[PDB]
Amino acid sequence: SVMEDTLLSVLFETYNPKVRPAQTVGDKVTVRVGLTLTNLLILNEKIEEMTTNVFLNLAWTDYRLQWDPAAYEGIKDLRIPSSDVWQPDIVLMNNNDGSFEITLHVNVLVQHTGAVSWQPSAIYRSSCTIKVMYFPFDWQNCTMVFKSYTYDTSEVTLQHALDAKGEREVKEIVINKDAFTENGQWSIEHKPSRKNWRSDDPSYEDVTFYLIIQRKPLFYIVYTIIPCILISILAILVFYLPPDAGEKMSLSISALLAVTVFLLLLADKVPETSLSVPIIIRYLMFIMILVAFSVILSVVVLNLHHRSPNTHTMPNWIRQIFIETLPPFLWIQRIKYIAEQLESASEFDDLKKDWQYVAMVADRLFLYVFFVICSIGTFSIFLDASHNVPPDNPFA
């Protein structure tokens, strides 16, 4: 008969795990709660939740679990099934899923002093409010709020878990150096913890662990930013084509079709939240508007190129501006009645070529204008996306 059996029989002769340990009426049980993030599984922005593999680290003192180790074979510590001992139901309040409790229910460790220590494992799905303004170049601030679902501040007192050395107090999510899987998409920046009670309700002591995770946007870059840049290059090129070739529309509208295809590609990844427009979506819409304006201006250029003296008469103002003002600033600078018919056709062709030259000047002007506009817009959007860096202060 191993004396551990006798010790268990002695401890749990009248022990009731349905009452909190209070040696005197009105005594509060101090519970230290910490977190150990083994793997940040996912942050699904479509449903705005984060799935994390965690080890909750609870430590309290049950005065009923005391014994003299000298009276036994030096049994300083003991391993008890979790269901056989009292435990504060330290649950995750802000869970997107309906599950509050832990998943594993590992054995609790009890010292002869009564210091019960518990390290259960869980797969928590906590609701995280996605700040979708700079997606994908965004830093998310997700939170995990742990507290006793039933016991208020007049029955339990929450504290931060002590380190391996009991002298200090850990104010952060303890990340195990080994046995930790670094998430491919997200990067941890700050992982603090704070006990944040609310003033309106005095009995709302709870411990909150924050994760400031910055996204690595390489996937979204390679799959949307570069193709949009190529489409923008094509839209700028549209105005270098000659109208006589007959492919201005065949290029511009096909670039628009490619933009639509990229929008279809992005339709399954952008968050479904209407607080703000993601910067990637703003860039997509800017490129789409630019391509639409390229189509419109190519249509205008083609209409100006095919204008004819027998269909249009060149106005005085156009003949003035597009002949004597822009070319300096754009570096263009250009047997009886048979003869009479040829001369008339020559004059008609001269006026037609004047229309064509006006079209060419307008085409060059639109080329320069759209190059400038596209470059400025893309540079501004990328600058704004780049400047979005999580604050050094975590505001723990």
């Binding site: 195990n176 998409q185 094509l234 250009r334 047997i335 001369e343």
Partner: protein, 420 residues
Amino acid sequence: VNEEERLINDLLIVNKYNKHVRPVKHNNEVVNIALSLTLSNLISLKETDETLTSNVWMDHAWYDHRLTWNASEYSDISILRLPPELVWIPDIVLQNNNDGQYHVAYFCNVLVRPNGYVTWLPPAIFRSSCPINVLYFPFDWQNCSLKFTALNYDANEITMDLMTDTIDGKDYPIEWIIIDPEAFTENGEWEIIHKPAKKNIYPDKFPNGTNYQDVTFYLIIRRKPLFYVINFITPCVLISFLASLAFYLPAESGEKMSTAISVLLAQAVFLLLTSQRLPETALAVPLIGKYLMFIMSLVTGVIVNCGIVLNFHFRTPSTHVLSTRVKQIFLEKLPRILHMSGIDSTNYIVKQIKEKNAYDEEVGNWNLVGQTIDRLSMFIITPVMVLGTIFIFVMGNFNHPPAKPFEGDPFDYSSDHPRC
């Protein structure tokens, strides 16, 4: 009557068998659990979720000195069967699993010998989380590990071990995922290569903790890229080589830009296809993705060059003048270096004929300039495209997992050659 009921009543009821007490004489000693894994079949490796779903039979074995009896006394009962709910079992748990399972799926009966030796082979479906090395997709190999730990007891109480088979004479540790050659069905698009097993200890942590010891079963699985080669790879490279032929089209027939831009649309469609098939990690761009970006930028460059050639083809004396140096260098070097192949009315009409002829000759010179720059661009681009795609896909194809499963270990964990 049956002697098994009497033996069970003696072992569990009369002897006060405490299920929650570790099976050891003294609290100071340790209980050794030897465990092994048998991969029944690899269900899937979903890279979009980084989830390895597998079916494994987990074999535990230990010594419970309370579950012992005199075999000759109870009618020579050799083996005994007992449900896990009645006897102490070590809760070996798969620590890394994106789904919150943590446990075997059946909890089948344990087999007990008269000397106390207890074995247990429950099956389980495990959805573990392993990162995807997407660098050489789809010609890539993944390294997915199942990590089992004893979170109920620390290393001072139970010590996990690799099971050790008894080969002729000596005992050799089983350091691999034992797989049945006959009853194993090879998974589609995945083949196991090395499948090593190792027990790890972390000295930086203390023995009186649940982090001190682990048992990890690794799987080096090589993806069979036949599906991707058939569907995504070959059509895309064919469309690219088709884009490469936009230079051979004469500028007279107005489809020079249309073919290139439609090839770009097709490559955009392929990009849409390949986007939905990979996780959004940023360790490195996948081989298919970086090849796609290379070829898409090359097609954009081809479109730009075709636009330049078309612009050069429609230059006219009324709008542009060909400089001496331009036509000189082009029409002299490039074809050779590329081995290309009343009476007043009459006076006025003849003058107009001569002027039109000169205009036509200059237009023809512009056309020749366009053709020669087109051929130059073709000879510059097409070799670049072919060499780039061949280099990318050869580099991807040569990617193989190392001959030895671990970095410095020369053992080459395999059932053929055991150690010790």
